[PDB]
Amino acid sequence: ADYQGKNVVIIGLGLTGLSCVDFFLARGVTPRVMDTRMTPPGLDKLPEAVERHTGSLNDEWLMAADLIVASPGIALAHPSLSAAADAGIEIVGDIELFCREAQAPIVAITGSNGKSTVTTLVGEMAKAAGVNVGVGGNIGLPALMLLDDECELYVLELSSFQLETTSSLQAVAATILNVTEDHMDRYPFGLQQYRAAKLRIYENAKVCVVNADDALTMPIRRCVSFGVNMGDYHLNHQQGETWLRVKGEKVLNVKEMKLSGQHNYTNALAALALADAAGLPRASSLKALTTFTGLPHRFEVVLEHNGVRWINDSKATNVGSTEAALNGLHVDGTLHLLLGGDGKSADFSPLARYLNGDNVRLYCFGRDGAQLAALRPEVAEQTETMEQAMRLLAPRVQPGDMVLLSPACASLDQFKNFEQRGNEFARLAKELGSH
Ligand SMILES: O=C(O)CC[C@H](NC(=O)c1cccc(CNc2ccc(/C=C3\SC(=S)NC3=O)cc2)c1)C(=O)O
Ligand SMILES: [Cl-]
Ligand SMILES: [Cl-]
Ligand SMILES: [Cl-]
Ligand SMILES: [Cl-]
Ligand SMILES: [Cl-]
Ligand SMILES: [Cl-]
């Protein structure tokens, strides 16, 4: 691409916005930056020579632009951005910029749940083969910070939002792991609009990897598949033990994995399918499956003490992710379940079927706390904050109980991000969980 002499406007700062600023400056192009926030993250790191406008979008700048680079955090439907599109002004995001430059194959991974785990796993498979791999996108480094001539493979986690502004991805292997209701606050044509954004990942992909158990992951019109009882990559249960299989052949007894649970085994299948399609040696890929320990904030045991397990699943920001934590969950005593935050207009009702019996208590907080308590009012308490909920539940915890933060919501109403929410949970668990 040639950006010389263009008027470029970057919308949205933060680390990813800053990576866009740096990308253009290194090519001798001075962009301008706007953000609807008054003091957005990274403002103090923006070089003084870069003009910026904050607290609103600037239509004089947008309508003057030759190229608009939109954060995934700003709606394409924002009237100002919609006006620019109507005027034929080109709008891309950071992932589009990256795709135009990248000089190694790209494995591209999206989905409502699983996408960070599978991205990280494929990265570990590549490391085990001695491949120089750049892993990031929607996690770790923004993609533009991974760009390096010595990189041999990129593995990118991509959101629905990033995909909406991307047109030049030609992935060596692409997947949608699953599609369950999420981000409805940003998709006013509902589940099929959200799906359509994700379906973009398959365009011009060399190999598409689909979930045989989730029809929404399939192109609307020759994909490789993974699934539980069905698929090219699937599971084989053998009398109290489980195997990963590829086309009828056993490749791994899951007792060798550190991760456990069915959805982690289907994440492993998806990661192996992508790694195979990317040409990584099967042997090293299997070895990586045995060494991978999981991500922070993903069903993470932060304290096991005095007969009580305190579990940080703060990464559960939608109903499907909480369902995956609860489905088949074994607790000896009472589950004390923390739910709450910004539910993004989700329907919480699918959780209700997991919340029967005499051994469940709900502690509901944040913007949508009341809607969550309503799932089963008789065993529910509502508080403003997560800290209040923890201090309410802690005196009630008995040996054999589990305390589970799996909140089914975004954290952004009260926290910086789900990591901060998870870290605060862990600090409070350690305080409240020992004498
Ligand atoms: O709890 C969490 O950590 C976050 C919740 C999570 N995140 C998102 O919904 C999400 C959607 C799009 C993009 C991002 C990360 N990047 C980002 C960039 C800019 C913003 C805010 C902007 S940009 C602009 S201009 N004005 C803004 O307010 C927010 C997030 C996050 C979700 O519930 O899945
Ligand atoms: Cl250029
Ligand atoms: Cl505005
Ligand atoms: Cl694009
Ligand atoms: Cl102990
Ligand atoms: Cl029960
Ligand atoms: Cl209290």
PDB file of C-alpha atoms and ligand atoms in Angstrom, residues 356-360, ligand 6:
ATOM      1  CA  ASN A 356     -31.927 -25.315  40.240  1.00  0.00           C
ATOM      2  CA  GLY A 357     -31.418 -27.404  43.356  1.00  0.00           C
ATOM      3  CA  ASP A 358     -30.637 -26.582  46.951  1.00  0.00           C
ATOM      4  CA  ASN A 359     -26.907 -26.040  46.501  1.00  0.00           C
ATOM      5  CA  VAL A 360     -26.749 -22.745  44.571  1.00  0.00           C
TER       6      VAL A 360
HETATM    7 CL    CL B   6     -27.799 -30.205  42.753  1.00  0.00          CL
END
